From Swiss-Prot:
<feature type="site" description="Responsible for the low discrimination between dNTP and rNTP">
    <location>
        <position position="23"/>
    </location>
</feature>
<protein>
    <recommendedName>
        <fullName>DNA-directed DNA/RNA polymerase mu</fullName>
    </recommendedName>
</protein>
<feature type="binding site">
    <location>
        <position position="8"/>
    </location>
    <ligand>
        <name>Mg(2+)</name>
    </ligand>
</feature>
<comment type="function">
    <text>Gap-filling polymerase involved in repair of DNA double-strand breaks by non-homologous end joining (NHEJ). Participates in immunoglobulin (Ig) light chain gene rearrangement in V(D)J recombination.</text>
</comment>
<comment type="similarity">
    <text>Belongs to the DNA polymerase type-X family.</text>
</comment>
DNA sequence: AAACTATGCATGCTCTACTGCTTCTGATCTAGTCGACT
């Protein structure tokens, strides 16, 4: 016998790997809140591809996912604690 | 010598193909709107 299970596949470059990983691990509400905080408080645009500064037209990529929280002035969280 | 017949020719008409130019039509590429998803 067999069963039908939904599977989602995403391909991203190594440079953008942490950004996509963060975008997909966190909950929908958590991602929305993080994006709103980034754009309103820190004034930076956050999406699944990278972090952008409208003032200085240069990407703020980083080699580790924790750098995203580090540069946004937020304490680091693990995926288990990002449940909305 | 005159009447009838014969050939001969020309021109307008009809059709079928042939070629080239012009216009219409069918196939192929994108903006917007709604919807689906992560």
């Amino acid at each position: 016998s067999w069963k039908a299970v939904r599977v989602d596949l995403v391909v991203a470059p190594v440079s953008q790997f942490p950004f996509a990983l963060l975008g997909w691990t966190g909950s929908k509400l958590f991602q929305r809140e993080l994006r709103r905080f980034s754009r309103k408080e820190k004034g930076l645009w956050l999406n699944s591809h990278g972090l952008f500064d409208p003032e200085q037209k240069t990407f703020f990529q980083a080699a580790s996912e924790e750098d995203i929280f580090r540069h946004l002035g937020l304490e680091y969280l693990p995926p288990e604690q990002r449940n909305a």
